Design a protein around this ligand. Sequence first.
Ligand SMILES: CN1c2c(nc(N)[nH]c2=O)NC[C@@H]1CNc1ccc(C(=O)N[C@@H](CCC(=O)O)C(=O)O)cc1
Ligand SMILES: CN1c2c(nc(N)[nH]c2=O)NC[C@@H]1CNc1ccc(C(=O)N[C@@H](CCC(=O)O)C(=O)O)cc1
Ligand SMILES: [Ca+2]
Ligand SMILES: [Ca+2]
Lengths: 262, 262
Amino acid sequence: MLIIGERINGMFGDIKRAIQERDPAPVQEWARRQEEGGARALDLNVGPAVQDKVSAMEWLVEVTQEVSNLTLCLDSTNIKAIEAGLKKCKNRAMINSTNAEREKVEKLFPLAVEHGAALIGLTMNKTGIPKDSDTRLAFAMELVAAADEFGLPMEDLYIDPLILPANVAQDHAPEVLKTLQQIKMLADPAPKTVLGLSAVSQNCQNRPLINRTFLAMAMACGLDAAIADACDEALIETAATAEILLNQTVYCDSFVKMFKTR
Amino acid sequence: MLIIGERINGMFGDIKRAIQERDPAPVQEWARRQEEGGARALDLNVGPAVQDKVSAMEWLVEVTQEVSNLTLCLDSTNIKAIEAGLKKCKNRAMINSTNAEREKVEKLFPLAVEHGAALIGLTMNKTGIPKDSDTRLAFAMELVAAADEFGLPMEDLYIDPLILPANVAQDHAPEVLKTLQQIKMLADPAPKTVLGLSAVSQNCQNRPLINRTFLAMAMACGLDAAIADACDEALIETAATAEILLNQTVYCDSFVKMFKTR
Ligand SMILES: CN1c2c(nc(N)[nH]c2=O)NC[C@@H]1CNc1ccc(C(=O)N[C@@H](CCC(=O)O)C(=O)O)cc1
Ligand SMILES: CN1c2c(nc(N)[nH]c2=O)NC[C@@H]1CNc1ccc(C(=O)N[C@@H](CCC(=O)O)C(=O)O)cc1
Ligand SMILES: [Ca+2]
Ligand SMILES: [Ca+2]
């Protein structure tokens, strides 16, 4: 399980201000803390508030790699900002993301290959986020074929079925688990899977509990990565424990510690 | 998710003495505590220490139903003990258990049917516990066929893949999840599944964490019931959260309390 730190996101007040005032301190501190928690990748989202998003992404990249060697997950719907971020990246990167829309596929897949970066693909297109697992799977397969079409190693493709809040979109959770399981059954080399975990508990009571529980469930269905709260110790425990229960990581009494220091 | 209180088991020192001394207090207290925790079924195991296991099982049934209306899960390898127990039960019972051995099947399935009781079936026989999910599933299918043969409603059949410690039999864990998953399919009306959860963390560190992490993972694979620590609040939280994430129970802010007071 690859935990992709979610905190460096412009939606958060302290990050929005840091980006605006170009104050590296807050961002660099969240990079450190998240890595200390066990994250091995860092999601970098400038947010919708900042004016120049291209320049902002570049900045987030430069200030972050100054204090971290972790993989940078460039999170933005602005492809120009993504490209700009990649050109500044000193370490392996992740593109977050592309969807099944053909127009975006032919821009992001080649872009991912050009930079040897990982690519996150959402199971959806202009038509919207499908509920039924069969439809989500269909989009996933289109992404799979795309990885082969453009020469992207299947292992660098992370398919995201898009989890939603369990209190107002509850019927989506099981459809997500089913999609992940179907994707897990694909032949070698099979693609990977990811999820913006925290969305499952939006507006719910005891979000950490919901987050933990779903992470464990998702991992049982093949989940390989999760953009989530790397500073949530209980969550990190689950990640570590889940790997053990899937026999992905050999057991030892300090399995939690080993996960955070590997 | 049906939590079957595991605590009234002769292997525990206090229960062993209570049975040997015929002191109802310890047993009745544990019965009430487990129900309050959220259990809706109580496992009753006289343990190996007591000499007369048939009258010990009758006693457990007597002192327990005296204070509890909960379904009683008669846990014994001695069929005479199970029979004597069933005859003492005033409420519907559960039989734990029968394995896939034909000789055992033709005695227990008819016994469960006669008493209108639930029956637990272990995916194993005289050759032992199969590690590979293929063989676990093979025995699971025999049990399903036997239920049809003897007239046991498929919903009263709980198949147990038999989980083992994650520190010495770690490769069994993923096989158990796969088996549960394949069982979840088969054909409607599909049978139910159960597990002696606590075995997964035996002799491990951070046992509660390992238990609840696996419970969640198991539930995503269709687990229906679990013999476990109904007095472990964190375990109960996981069960309640898992039902929500599978859309088996409608979300509401106090879903945990609702699960417990259900
Ligand atoms: C849509 N999510 C997502 C993605 N990328 C992919 N590939 N998939 C996804 O599902 N990128 C962004 C987001 C994941 N990150 C996050 C980050 C924070 C919160 C969150 O819980 N935010 C708080 C904000 C609190 C504040 O404003 O101070 C919230 O309550 O909404 C959720 C998901
Ligand atoms: C084999 N388990 C089991 C079953 N029935 C079915 N169908 N399936 C199962 O896996 N019945 C009994 C047991 C379930 N109950 C339990 C009860 C206690 C512990 C446990 O953790 N015991 C302690 C011993 C504590 C003491 O002796 O004081 C241990 O660490 O071993 C595990 C499972
Ligand atoms: Ca996987
Ligand atoms: Ca089931």
